[PDB]
Symmetry: D2
Subunit: 326 residues, 4 copies
């Protein structure tokens, strides 16, 4: 049986409710040892070691936990066969992409959460955890990047996103599809991400104790420039715009971000729109403004990459090249 | 033949490109008269009158144009059979909901855009415009609220949203589905929005020359409180949170918005997540904080409703009731 | 305070007797006074006209005795049964179908909560006059549009053309849609006195398709044949040939599509009026069968069957 | 500077001779040196084995003469043809299929830009070694997973299980996926010397389904029968009966599903090894037919056909 390390960070998967039918849930309550012990069936498919990293709702996920996770995986890569990270659902997709860029182990790293607490009727956590371990244990999962396993589906950490606020089936790779489906404890992989991940990225956070400051501003009708201005005022390294349509900006936001990019703030145009690329060669001449188009990376994903791009370079052409290959 | 009034506001539907294959487009270039004349086939199905309201990219849409549109439709409701509004795609879904709440005519009001300029190969604007008129002309379209007609589909202004950055098929009613499909210039309606719209809402903007100030803050891992703080500092009437998952907030954003709601700022929890309701009775006790859950309204839609709710009342219980019925 | 809900069990992975099933979900007791009757205990892959006729008559007979019905059922043909009941039930109280994608013994089994939410839906006053319903994965779906979209996913049931009626959260439903097509007491289909249904078969279309299935139905003197066509209800030539001649000896022929969403329309490439065919609109081939079988209890005239496929 | 692209025309709404078609989209001249050959001029609803065999042989014979192929085709069975070519083409240069949902004369017709993007895809060096492709609505889709999801929508073609390979914007493609299942020169299927294919028919399953289509194929001595099952490939009893006896006189039986997404799996409710059936995995019934017809040129053994349905 393979050696699988479970790194817990919290989430509803480690929470509870006051009855089997209540909809109000706690987060990060149950310790990794108890969490692992609640699914004895894991012992059929791996030798599990549990470690508590933090115990929080993933809505409070942050740079400190990200750095911690990457360093821990990178250090311990040698001495296990794969990793599962238990995490809240809310920002699962951000952490998975951050690890997909900073983990240098080629061994399977699989993220998993639950939409219902283990106390609820038909709770999804036990089987999710089982399937996540199945995936971490499978030789075929190596070299595919950081994965998220939810609803019997293996999803790449780049494209995966939370598409519905409550559905157990919420996690989908909405532009390029999943890698594999899980049936009877086995996976038929038919796809792997072509974008460079893990050991083929330049991003090395091993010696870093902070990341560049990158915030996100939303666009909509009559959008205030005040949020963009506050980020600039605070010397943020980067700003990601959640634009309208194909990465467009409301005039007053556009004006502030244009000014910030001429003084050296990195500006990435992403989109509030849930599928499809923010392209070049549409309404915004990115070269002219010193902006970067995010491609299929949604705003929170664009943030991840831009923060890491900023550990390498402050140059808009070099950042756009990063956004074309990772 | 029915009398149909076309109110133009701009968009790519009224723009162009330098060749049939270029991807870079102008917005709001073509005047309503020329725009109507480019589709002579409209004269088979209606007597069209065109009026230019503004000529802009809908990424620059704003409160002034909204007020203008509602007042114009309300004034002229008597003296036409229906309306089509040509508009950019980027914020089409915001304007359609704003009109869905403030138009008091029960006659069909139909919004339409194009994803490609009329100069491009297989441009979508001509047929979109034709189908929008078909819909405005159809007796069955009355009493269904403000509609958007794109890709042979009739969509309610509440649920409709732009789901893809470039696809002609981008507009979808992602929670409840469309009202009707268009084939051979005819519509089979099988659904109508149960939420109160048009003449069954209390919202009357006829004498207003501004709307309440409502901004949108995004949530993500390590989110700065600076945007929320700038809105509060500027005395915004309302703030909508584009939360993570089921409307959750990053701790520092939560802290700022909690404070703003205790001093009387209206705070609506919506979600960055593209489908499903922001519910009550999940992780956030809205009553305790004086917050309002947005239901299926996405952040930009929540903004529309909250601005209008703020013309009636500043009370969180009364605003939540509005968010339960409109 | 609690409504009386009748559970009518037909089998499925959700099930093993109806008593065992109810007694394994004791939380139903918080929302309803549950009464269980075993109608049959089969996999829905073996569902048939007799079970349909039985369900419809029982529901209509016992309508006065209860506040609502939940029908436990296999997933495989739940969308067929739901539509039949949608067209034949005259009781105006909720009738909700439910199944399970996972075995009751499996980790994270869906059945118990699915059942709970089905009873919630049948208990809700707001559920009445919306036709027959299917309740799966926290969603309430109308019996006409609802279909099984995936072979294994717990989220498989979707109303692929017109969307769901409502979502369930915390034992409460926010309904924002109701089906406009006529149902339940507004249809003319009355199966009270019927002990058989008309014979309607389904033939598939594909590259190089054989005419042998279609001829074998026609030789068997089938009252109706539904074509699962390609694209917008088109047919492979040797199949069009058989059905065109069969529509003319009097066999009703409905064109549907193997394509999983969208309408088989009139006025595309098949001149239906010329051949006496009927276009199925958004009804998939199995759903078209249900409606065609019922149409044929009222009329054999193609023009009148079309009107039926335009109203129901 | 421009690549030589061969357009092989088979008909469809996209078309009317191949010369007229090419000459109506003169913008193709900016991206390719286009050469047109009329192979056939039919609606794809009447597509067949002979056209398939013809396309495969022409592509393989003329591989050296051109840099890539675009096949203009009806939409109705484009996903069948694409998969056949996916399994039989040995040329490693791009082969891209394309159609149109709207008439060429209609407002906002899709054909011209669809054709342009198909030629862009066949011209792109990055398109090579990805198998046979379908290019529709600004998207590049692999021939195995791609299917027609809607009867009328211009956005109908989707890879419903594994997603698209790449999106087209401004005449350029960002490929992020390639099919892992073996294709093109990595399959053993060689149709160079073949002038017929094995006979494989499709039967539909539904409530109360007739065994008559299945018996009529078996009586006709069909080499294979694909079942479009319910749910996870299940069969109505009287249909399971016929196929179980037929698999035992030697007819190959593949279980697929009418359910539009997801795998017909092994190890669910049908003990395939016991009955000598083969599970289709994610291949829908029409796609399973393609693979079963080709399997049967190499072997009649059910265990070996299964291995084929596990690798291709
Ligand atoms: N279901 C969940 O895990 C949601 C929770 N707020 C979290 O992300 O930690
Ligand atoms: N296609 C379009 O209309 C997009 C444009 N930026 C607009 O919204 O005005
Ligand atoms: N999950 C299930 O219910 C499938 C089963 N074959 C049925 O329809 O009964
Ligand atoms: N739009 C089309 O191509 C449909 C036509 N029946 C075909 O497949 O040829």
């Amino acid at each position: 049986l393979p050696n699988i390390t479970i790194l817990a960070t919290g989430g509803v998967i480690a929470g509870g409710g006051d009855s089997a039918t209540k909809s109000n849930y706690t987060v990060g309550k149950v310790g990794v040892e108890n969490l692992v012990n609640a699914v004895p069936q894991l012992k059929d498919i791996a030798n599990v070691k549990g470690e508590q990293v933090v115990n929080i709702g993933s809505q409070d996920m942050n740079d400190n936990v990200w750095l911690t996770l990457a360093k821990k995986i990178n250090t311990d890569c040698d001495k296990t066969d794969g990793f599962v990270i238990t995490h809240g659902t809310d920002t699962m997709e951000e952490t998975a992409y951050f690890l997909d860029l900073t983990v240098k182990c080629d061994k399977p790293v699989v993220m998993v959460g639950a939409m219902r607490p283990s106390t609820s009727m038909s709770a999804d956590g036990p089987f999710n955890l089982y399937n996540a371990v199945v995936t971490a244990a499978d030789k075929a999962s190596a070299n595919r990047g950081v994965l998220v396993v939810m609803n019997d589906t293996v999803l790449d950490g780049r494209d995966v996103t939370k598409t519905n606020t409550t559905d157990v089936a919420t996690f989908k790779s909405v532009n390029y599809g999943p890698l594999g489906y899980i049936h009877n404890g086995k996976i038929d992989y038919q796809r792997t991400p072509a974008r460079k991940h893990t050991s083929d990225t330049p991003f090395d956070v091993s010696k870093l104790n902070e990341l560049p400051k990158v915030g996100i501003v939303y666009n909509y009708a009559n959008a205030s420039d005040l949020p963009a201005k506050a980020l600039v005022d605070a010397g943020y390294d980067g700003i990601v715009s959640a634009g309208v349509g194909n990465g467009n900006l409301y005039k007053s936001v556009f004006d502030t971000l244009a000014t910030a990019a001429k003084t050296g703030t990195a500006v990435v145009r992403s989109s509030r729109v849930p599928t499809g690329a923010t392209t070049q060669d549409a309404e915004v001449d990115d070269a002219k403004y010193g902006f970067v188009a995010s491609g299929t990376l949604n705003p929170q994903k664009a943030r991840v990459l831009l923060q890491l791009a900023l550990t390498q370079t402050k140059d808009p052409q070099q950042i756009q090249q990063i956004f074309n290959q990772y």
